[PDB]
Ligand SMILES: Cc1sc2c(c1C)C(c1ccc(Cl)cc1)=N[C@@H](CC(=O)OC(C)(C)C)c1[nH]nc(C)[n+]1-2
């Protein structure tokens with residue numbers, strides 16, 4: 311789509327390059343990070359690797375569907391972590407860029 | 418703005434009319450609802466009344482700034498409540514409509 315291609319080519323590409331993006335490239339590994347409560351607190355895990363793959367496989371029916379996965383990704387981070395945690399502040403920075411780019415999307 | 422006017426006239430108006438919107442018309446009243454931990458868990462309270470007022474007062478510098486307040490509103494609800502709670506499912510429904518309408522915004 312003009313809109314889905316834009317989510318892959320502008321939104322994912324911009325965010326992927328950001329210095330704060332690295333924690334979100336792959337799923338939260340609750341085993342490696344020793345987070346036994348992660349999967350009971352977070353019911354819909356999401357990450358940017360998954361989103362990028364979904365865009366490439368034409369998983370989404372609409373740009374809004376993709377936007378939802380980004381929102382989930384960020385929200386999961388705010389649900390699991392304390393409001394002052396580094397990872398929260400990083401997510402907020404990334405979420406702001408996400409929104410700024412979503413607002414400049416074509417109709 | 419074309420975009421900010423659209424956030425007031427389409428996004429707020431559509432959501433306000435929705436059957437699930439009523440909990441979000443005004444700030445969470447942690448006293449009336451007996452929620453002593455609400456304000457320590459939720460660092461940025463947000464509601465649609467506040468957003469609507471902000472739009473009318475030209476508080477926002479951009480549509481993305483407004484979008485951020487909506488995201489905060491919904492996220493607060495997911496942070497404070499359990500994933501199976503009625504209020505969470507209501508927020509998810511409203512958030513989906515928010516995103517569907519954001520995707521149909523003018524550039
Ligand atoms: C690869 C990934 S994914 C991730 C993190 C890392 C490292 C980090 C993290 C990332 C960056 C900085 Cl500066 C700090 C923490 N935190 C965890 C939660 C946690 O508590 O992990 C520690 C036990 C603290 C490791 C978390 N929640 N949500 C996400 C996306 N992450």
Ligand SMILES: Cc1sc2c(c1C)C(c1ccc(Cl)cc1)=N[C@@H](CC(=O)OC(C)(C)C)c1[nH]nc(C)[n+]1-2
Nearest residue numbers: 439440441444445446450451493494497498503504
């Ligand atoms: C006016 C408002 S604002 C609100 C609620 C109500 C009623 C409801 C609520 C609204 C609708 C349904 Cl069907 C169920 C609950 N819940 C609280 C949290 C809570 O625990 O409140 C109870 C103690 C359960 C009252 C909450 N969190 N976030 C928000 C926006 N709210």
